[PDB]
Design an enzyme around this catalytic site. Sequence first.
Site, PDB file in Angstrom:
ATOM      1  CE  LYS A 182      -3.647  -2.439  -0.077  1.00 30.11           C
ATOM      2  NZ  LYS A 182      -2.866  -3.686  -0.099  1.00 30.11           N
TER       3      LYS A 182
HETATM    4  C1  LIG Z   1      -5.750  -6.185   0.197  1.00 29.70           C
HETATM    5  C2  LIG Z   1      -6.966  -5.293   0.195  1.00 29.70           C
HETATM    6  C3  LIG Z   1      -7.841  -5.334   1.282  1.00 29.70           C
HETATM    7  C4  LIG Z   1      -7.445  -5.905   2.632  1.00 29.70           C
HETATM    8  O1  LIG Z   1      -6.469  -5.108   3.251  1.00 29.70           O
HETATM    9  P1  LIG Z   1      -5.481  -5.716   4.361  1.00 29.70           P
HETATM   10  O2  LIG Z   1      -4.915  -4.490   5.052  1.00 29.70           O
HETATM   11  O3  LIG Z   1      -4.412  -6.500   3.634  1.00 29.70           O
HETATM   12  O4  LIG Z   1      -6.278  -6.605   5.289  1.00 29.70           O
HETATM   13  C5  LIG Z   1      -9.133  -4.871   1.136  1.00 29.70           C
HETATM   14  N1  LIG Z   1      -9.571  -4.364  -0.071  1.00 29.70           N
HETATM   15  C6  LIG Z   1      -8.722  -4.286  -1.135  1.00 29.70           C
HETATM   16  C7  LIG Z   1      -9.278  -3.735  -2.413  1.00 29.70           C
HETATM   17  C8  LIG Z   1      -7.417  -4.750  -1.016  1.00 29.70           C
HETATM   18  O5  LIG Z   1      -6.573  -4.672  -2.085  1.00 29.70           O
END
Ligand SMILES: *Cc1c(COP(=O)(O)O)cnc(C)c1O
Lengths: 367, 365
Positions: A182
């Site tokens: 991210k």
């Molecule tokens: C990976 C992601 C999530 C989950 O996030 P995490 O912090 O890894 O639990 C939710 N929605 C989208 C679109 C993602 O890419």
Amino acid sequence: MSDFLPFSRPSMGDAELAALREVLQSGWITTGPKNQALEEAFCQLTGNRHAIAVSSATGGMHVTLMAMGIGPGDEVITPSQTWVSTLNMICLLGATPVMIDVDHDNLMITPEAVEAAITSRTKAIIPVHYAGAPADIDAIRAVGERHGIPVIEDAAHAAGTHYKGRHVGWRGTAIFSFHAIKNMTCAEGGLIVTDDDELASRIRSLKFHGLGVDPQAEVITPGFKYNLADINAALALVQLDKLAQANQRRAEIAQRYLRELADTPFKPLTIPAWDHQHAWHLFIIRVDEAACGISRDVLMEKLKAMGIGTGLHFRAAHTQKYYRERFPEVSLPNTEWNSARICSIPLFPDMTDDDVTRVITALHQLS
Amino acid sequence: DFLPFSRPSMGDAELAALREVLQSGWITTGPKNQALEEAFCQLTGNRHAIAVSSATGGMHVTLMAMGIGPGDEVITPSQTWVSTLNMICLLGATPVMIDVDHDNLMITPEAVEAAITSRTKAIIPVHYAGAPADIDAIRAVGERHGIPVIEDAAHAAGTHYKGRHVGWRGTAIFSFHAIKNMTCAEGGLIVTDDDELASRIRSLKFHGLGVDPQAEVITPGFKYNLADINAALALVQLDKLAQANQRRAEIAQRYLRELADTPFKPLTIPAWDHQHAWHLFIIRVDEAACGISRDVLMEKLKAMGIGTGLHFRAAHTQKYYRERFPEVSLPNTEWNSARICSIPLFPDMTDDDVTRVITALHQLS
Ligand SMILES: *Cc1c(COP(=O)(O)O)cnc(C)c1O
Ligand SMILES: *Cc1c(COP(=O)(O)O)cnc(C)c1O
């Protein structure tokens, strides 16, 4: 593999290590003042009222839907074109995901598709802000408001995304991710913003064992453990301080990809017509065998042989075994067409200009 | 000048491990997780180790992987942390709360046997304060009835039972929370000798992904994976654990000796062969014997700059469980829950820190 260019890498350096040293020296390593500062920082960033730091965006989605009372007999509208966490959390609360299609060129749900899928059972709508662009959230919110259905925004890709001049999550409820790929990361983490006092109160309790005051704290109703340690919150604070510059560099890279792939058959996503600032979390291309002379899978394999990583964000949920077999009638043409043809090429702010040239050159060679 | 009841031992070794992970660029689950899991297989002797984001999450996915749900009973003390009770309930299963021994706060095989029904699908003993429960006798009850025993080993990193580390066989769950004897701020780890259970747990702590070809959701799962940042901290803390526990034992021995002529009553040391990890030093504070109540002792100690903890307020006395299961009546649990507190015990305590605590307790008697 020192010459491998992955599709993402974090920007961890001396600032992160110094923040970690500070937390370690303090002796207060789990949830504490760094969590509070991160939450206050996200209230200032978004403008929204409440911020709740959590151990992952998945856990954040879990406790947000739980706090809303989502359970058996309830439907939740969601794209299939997303990460499976959201669909899994709906199911594991006993509710039913109602998978809808997405726009064929920006991979985000439309207000019309939402409205068509509403039933008397619908208890939430979960749009995804995809790849760093925002969904048309005012129009989706208007559909929800007309029916009395809350909208919960999946803003995993949208740290630094603006919509009509405000940061995503300035009102309503939105969930950010700090996973390693991210735009700001603390390896694993997330954060919920909301304008709803009662929802925030419930979430805070349900991410930490259901504890609350009836007197001393005690279990009011069973909850989960999704609190974020201060070691991680401190990393997230450093990465938030870096986010504007990180996103500026991401945008410079993405603009170069848009320009220099314009005369290749690879097809980026389309930029939404509504006013926004794109965070450029992912640079996605569609690879159509008939136009490109190479398939998506073979492109990923040959790029890898050239030392260039790629990702698949995402294999549509409804095409995966559990959902394929539980929901065999679901037919989502835009999703299915894109899910078979998309990949994410390298995009992260520590990429050099020559890294970008390497990717562009390989794509021109493989066309 | 405040002396808390616990503080982690973090220094240059932890910072160097973090530096290595950050420099690698691989900050979530990766090679440090693999190394931590291998290290716990070497520590315990058991076959499978699965690192998780917390012991609570580990309990959640372990019970889920066993198929625990609506209609199923799970035998557990009330005298434990509420996480276990919560996870039972949030899977839709029914906790069956039993009493504990009045002097070591752990469940007995007789109490387990008495609570078994045709609906019982698991038994969850707690290894309390660093001592092991009589796990062979509890396992024997489970085996006779065909009921798995899942061990809550949060307090028992470094605990030995009859010459082996806790979790050497069977299934046990460790915690790496900030006050535990080895910490990565938040984290946990499941050991098991059951290949199928291990396979299910690994999938269910990471989204239910598995191979039916490429990985895909086989059945919905949760997100309870441990980052390599944290795993690297856990590895350093495991390398320190033997020395940390030795120092904890020295402090605990001094408390046992120098509180012997005070009315404060430590827990009793089990008669079965063991090595105590000394996670907590718990005293019972009986106002009739001590001239001071537990709550007032905690308050006066705080006024003197000395922190204390309450491990634990029995689950069945807390609002949700008191109102959902008002019939639960557990005399040894209730007597102790009203009288226990945890005095400072952590390896960074100096001799003078320990003297300060002992002096205050003698003064407050
Ligand atoms: C990976 C992601 C999530 C989950 O996030 P995490 O912090 O890894 O639990 C939710 N929605 C989208 C679109 C993602 O890419
Ligand atoms: C705190 C604790 C747990 C839960 O551990 P976490 O790592 O915080 O999830 C389980 N059992 C006992 C006895 C504990 O003290």
